[PDB]
Structures are given as structure tokens and as C-alpha cells.
Amino acid sequence: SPTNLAKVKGITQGPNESPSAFLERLKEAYRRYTPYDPEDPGQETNVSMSFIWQSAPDIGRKLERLEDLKSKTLGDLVREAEKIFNK
Amino acid sequence: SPTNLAKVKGITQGPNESPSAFLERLKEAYRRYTPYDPEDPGQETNVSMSFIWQSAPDIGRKLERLEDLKSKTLGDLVREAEKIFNK
Ligand SMILES: [Co+2]
């Protein structure tokens, strides 16, 4: 599909949706509606920021407060979100 | 300031504001409210996405449609935005 950033911003984690399932849906939107490959090392911070911003609000607020946030990989962020999601 | 992604999302080009002045404010928000340095080359596609998304909608829609958008530098996007802004 032709580039449409709104489609990427429109991927929001559902109330029952696991962080890893949400991340896969977010990556699919990057693939379909941007020229950026969400698996590229150069895109990690970009996907990470969308992941944090568009996670369910309780999760997003906690991910944003992680210590040494800059050091967190996309995999780290998913694991931290899962801790909040699973309790 | 402590990380606060809403402040980055809240930087939007003003109705009469030049693209270059808007990008300066967007970079300032990245510096103040994220751990991501907007002058780090590793962050350029991240700042570029925010710039397209948060530009005035007429400009952002045109930037989305640039041929070979993936190869545009942040400096390229600003120049093309300035070309649109100045008629
Ligand atoms: Co496509």
C-alpha cells in the first residue's frame, strides 16, 4: 500500500491483547504502509517509540518510566510490558 | 526532564510556522523529554517520522508521497517541506 503514516499511528493495543501480539500487528502496519522495515536495526528506536506510545495506557506509562529506558531493546520492552500485562 | 513522549507528540507545526522553525521545536522536545538525541544519526528515521506526521497536514501528505521516501534524509524532508511552504 502507498505510504500512510496514520495507519501506523492507528495500531493501538487492545484491552485483552498481549504485548507481543500487539507488536506483531504494529510491525505489520509498518510493512504495509511505510517504506521502513520494522526489523531493521536502524528502525528499532522508531518502532520502540510507537510501541511505547500506542501500548495500553497503564503499560505505556510504566514503560516510559523504566530506568535506563534508552538501553531497552524492542525485546526488552515487550518483556517489561508482559510483566505489567500478566501480573 | 523525565521522559514524556506526549510532549514530543504535542509538537505540531503552527499554521504560519515555517518547517525549519517547527523542526527546531521538535528537536528541542526530543532533547528535553526523551533519552533519544535528535542529532544522533541513529535517531534520524525516528525524528523524520515525527516530522512528517506532525507537519501541517498539507505538507505531511505531500512528504508521504515523495518518490524514494526511504532514502530522504531529515535535511531532504525539511527542504521539500520548505519548498511547499514557500509556494
Ligand atoms: Co505498501
B4 CB-contact burial (10 Å; exposed 0-12 / middle 13-18 / buried 19+): middle
A5, A65, A70 ranked by CB distance to B52: nearest: A5
**A12 contact B CB<8A:** no
Q: How far is CA B20 from the centre of its chain?
A: 9
Q: How far is Cα B28 from Cα A10, in angstroms, rounded to an integer?
A: 25
Q: Do A35 and B9 touch (CB under 8 A)?
A: no
How is residue A54 written as a grid cell? 500506542
What's the domain range around B85?
1-87
Check if the beta carbon of residue B53 is closer than 8 Å to that of residue B64.
Answer: no
- All residues of chain A having their beta carbon less than 8 Å from the beta carbon of residue B35 are 69-70
In A10-86, at which residue ranges do the beta strands (DSSP E only) sit?
none
Helix (H) and strand (E) counts in chain A:
5, 0
A2, A9, A69 ranked by CB distance to B53: nearest: A9
Q: How far is Cα B22 from Cα B10, in angstroms, rounded to an integer?
A: 12
Q: Do A46 and B42 touch (CB under 8 A)?
A: no
Q: How far is Cα A40 from Cα A43, in angstroms, rounded to an integer?
A: 5
How is residue B14 written as a grid cell? 503552527
Q: How far is the CA of A87 from the centre of ligand 1 (A)?
A: 37
Q: In total, how many domains does chain B have?
A: 1
- Tell me the resolution in Å: 1.9
Count of CB atoms situated within 10 Å of the CB of B82:
14
Identify the closest residue of chain B to A6 by CA–CA distance.
Answer: B53
**B31 contact A CB<8A:** no
Q: How far is Cα B64 from Cα B73, in angstroms, rounded to an integer?
A: 13
**Alpha helices per DSSP H over chain B:** 5-9, 19-33, 44-54, 57-64, 74-85
* Residue to substitute from A3, A32, A40, A73, interface B, most B β-carbons within 10 A: A3
